[PDB]
């Protein structure tokens, strides 16, 4: 098992439903054409995942104000936290590419947003760390995550158009997901 990973077992039901989902997917231009390529993207990404996270944490860990979010109260990086989160992140990359975007998925998007927000942050791994990830970086992270991703989508031998649609499906998925994760951060009624 992957510790802390509780997909389909949140227990706890999302405040947004499947109609909300249809409507947000439309805002983000996500169609059945995108579900083909997001999963195609899975195949291309599966065995590259370790190297992706190395480029990811290499970006986080090269900025103090972002590494911050992984630190012990003494301002040193919690190595256990980093490594515990790394694994669920790994699994998310795959989930995005493999789960059906349904009630359970939605329930876990609620979960994940709660884990970034002060509501649930740090309870999953029983670490002591910063209480809240300020929402501004969640939005901002949309850029580096998407953009780091692009080379990795090519590397496994794919024709610019194959890569551009995989990329775009990934861009939309990320945006969509983040948008959903904003729920706990937003003043009630403004979501």
Q: Does 65 bind its own copies (CB under 8 A)?
A: yes
Any known ligand binding at 30?
Answer: no
Q: Is 104 in the site for its own copies (CB under 8 A)?
A: no
Q: Is 1 near its own copies (CB under 8 A)? A: no
As a whole number of angstroms, the distance between CA 181 and CA 135 comes to: 9
Question: If you write DSSP's letter for every residue of 47-116 in order, what string do you get?
Answer: GGHHHHHHHHHHHHTT-HHHHGGGB-TTSSB-HHHHHHHHHHHHHHHHHHTTS-SSHHHHHHHHHHHHHH
63 in contact with its own copies (CB under 8 A): yes
- 135 counts as binding ligand HEM under rule CB under 6 A: no
Task: Say if CB 122 and CB 129 are below 8 A apart.
Answer: yes
Question: From residue 85 to residue 114, what is the string marking binding to ligand HEM with x (rule CB under 6 A)?
Answer: x--xx--x-------------------x--
User: Which of 141, 152, 170, 185 is the binder for ligand HEM (CB under 6 A)?
Assistant: 141
CA distances to 19, 80, 90, 156, 178 from 54, rounded to whole Å, are 37, 16, 11, 18, 21
Select the binding partner of residue 2 from ligand HEM, its own copies, none (C-beta < 5 to 8 A, by kind). Answer: none
Instruction: Round to whole Å and give the CA distance between 29 and 176.
Output: 10
Under the binding rule (CB under 6 A), the answer on residue 176 touching ligand HEM is no
Bind-site residues: 81, 88-89, 108, 115-116, 122
Bind-site residues for heme b: 81, 88-89, 108, 115-116, 122
Binding site for ligand HEM (CB under 6 A): 4-5, 60, 66, 69-70, 85, 88-89, 92, 112, 115-116, 121-122, 124, 133, 137-138, 141-142, 145, 174, 178
């Amino acid at each position: 098992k992957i510790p802390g990973y509780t997909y389909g077992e949140t227990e706890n039901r999302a405040p947004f439903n499947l109609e909300d989902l249809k409507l947000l997917k439309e805002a983000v231009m996500f169609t059945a054409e995108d579900e083909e390529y997001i999963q195609k993207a899975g195949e291309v990404l599966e065995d590259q995942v370790e190297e992706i996270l190395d480029t990811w944490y290499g970006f986080v860990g090269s900025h103090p104000h972002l590494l911050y979010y992984f630190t012990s109260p003494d301002g040193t990086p919690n190595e256990k936290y980093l490594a515990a989160v790394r694994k669920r992140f790994s699994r998310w990359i795959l989930d995005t590419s493999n789960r059906s975007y349904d009630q359970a998925w939605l329930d876990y998007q609620y979960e994940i947003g709660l884990r970034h927000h002060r509501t649930k942050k740090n309870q999953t791994d029983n670490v002591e760390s910063v209480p809240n990830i300020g929402y501004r970086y969640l939005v901002a992270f949309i850029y580096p995550f998407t953009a780091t991703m692009k080379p990795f989508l090519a590397r496994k031998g794919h024709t610019p158009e194959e890569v551009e649609k995989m990329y775009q499906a990934w861009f939309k998925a990320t945006t969509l997901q983040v948008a959903l994760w904003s729920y706990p951060y937003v003043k009630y009624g403004d979501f």
